[PDB]
Design a protein around this motif. Sequence first.
Motif, short mmCIF file in Angstrom:
data_model
loop_
_atom_site.label_atom_id
_atom_site.label_comp_id
_atom_site.label_asym_id
_atom_site.label_seq_id
_atom_site.Cartn_x
_atom_site.Cartn_y
_atom_site.Cartn_z
N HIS B 250 0.84 -1.20 0.00
CA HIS B 250 0.00 0.00 0.00
C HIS B 250 0.88 1.25 0.00
N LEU B 260 -5.56 4.16 -3.20
CA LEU B 260 -5.20 3.29 -4.32
C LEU B 260 -5.35 1.82 -3.92
N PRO B 262 -3.95 -2.13 -3.71
CA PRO B 262 -2.61 -2.68 -3.46
C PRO B 262 -1.85 -2.91 -4.76
#
Lengths: 88, 301
Positions: B250, B260, B262
């Motif tokens: 992450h 976002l 992973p």
Amino acid sequence: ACPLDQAIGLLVAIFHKYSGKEGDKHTLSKKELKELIQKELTIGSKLQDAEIARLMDDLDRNKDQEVNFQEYVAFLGALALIYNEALK
Amino acid sequence: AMAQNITARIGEPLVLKCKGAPKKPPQRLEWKLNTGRTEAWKVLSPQGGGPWDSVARVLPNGSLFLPAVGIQDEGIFRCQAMNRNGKETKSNYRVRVYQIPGKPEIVDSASELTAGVPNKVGTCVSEGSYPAGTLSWHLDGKPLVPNEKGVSVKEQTRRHPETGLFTLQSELMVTPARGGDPRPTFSCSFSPGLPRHRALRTAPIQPRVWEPVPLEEVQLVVEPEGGAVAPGGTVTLTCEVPAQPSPQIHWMKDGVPLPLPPSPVLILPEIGPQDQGTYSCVATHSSHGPQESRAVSISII
Ligand SMILES: [Ca+2]
Ligand SMILES: [Ca+2]
Ligand SMILES: [Cl-]
Ligand SMILES: [Cl-]
Ligand SMILES: [Cl-]
Ligand SMILES: [Cl-]
Ligand SMILES: [Cl-]
Ligand SMILES: [Cl-]
Ligand SMILES: [Zn+2]
Ligand SMILES: [Zn+2]
Ligand SMILES: [Zn+2]
Ligand SMILES: [Zn+2]
Ligand SMILES: [Zn+2]
Ligand SMILES: [Zn+2]
């Protein structure tokens, strides 16, 4: 303190900085070697891709596509005298 | 002392003088000895074809002759003689023997040592000495004393029953300190226990020292290395977790996780001043606390 201890320590560290990226951690693949030449060495700034490929082939004496520490020492040896003429 | 110490090389002839003995008959003289062969006092008769005549024989001048001395000939040799004056003379010898081994060798030596951990530098081997003798090491041309550091030696002595000669071994172990001599120079030497004699030395070896970069559990590399880039263009961030087959990575900016999914990689194209900040990645694992990579400072100039 000693500039010799310092430079030799540096040459050992530089070799392993690139040799440990992929494959055998104590030999330089074409990829690792090209990066070493372009990033740390004066002689490589001027060189083009076709020239570097020729240089790398001539550094690999036993034709296993790897440059080991011995083949690398021989490299530096030649460089010492090549750099030497340029400094005159 | 009364007893004269005699030092003789194994395999070589030895003559022991019977002092004060007439050079020609008549001679009133008698040799008495006690060696490894006799395990007792024996008179050594001067007549030919005696029990020991292949090993020790009395010469016409009364001297005792040994054609080729061996380890078992070590011991005490006494001659009692009488001159033609009636002059009583005694000769007392203590015989010790020796052999010089071949030049010592360093076997299985290391081309490269790893700083920070124990390394077997090599094993010094010496073959064919009597008596045993000893092996010692030199470093940068000076004696290397054991159990300082980091420095240790495993020694062994072995006797060959077929010759009585010794094989010596000395295994050197060092832990090079970080920042130390990148090309330490070693050599080994054999010191005879008898007689007083020059040390026999190996050719030196010069292994290099490699200093491993400290291994981070979560590894972050940035291209270009600096994390500094011209306006516009790209920076790529790459994360690796060596100990995990399927890591969950992450991305974070300035200590805050980015919105976002992973991913092992984060590319920042078309860099503007707004993309400036401290980046890092976090590897999460079920049942374990999260791990963070090193922080990389990304800027423009
Ligand atoms: Ca490699
Ligand atoms: Ca090669
Ligand atoms: Cl200099
Ligand atoms: Cl290596
Ligand atoms: Cl030193
Ligand atoms: Cl040293
Ligand atoms: Cl070197
Ligand atoms: Cl998430
Ligand atoms: Zn110096
Ligand atoms: Zn190496
Ligand atoms: Zn044996
Ligand atoms: Zn040193
Ligand atoms: Zn000698
Ligand atoms: Zn996440």
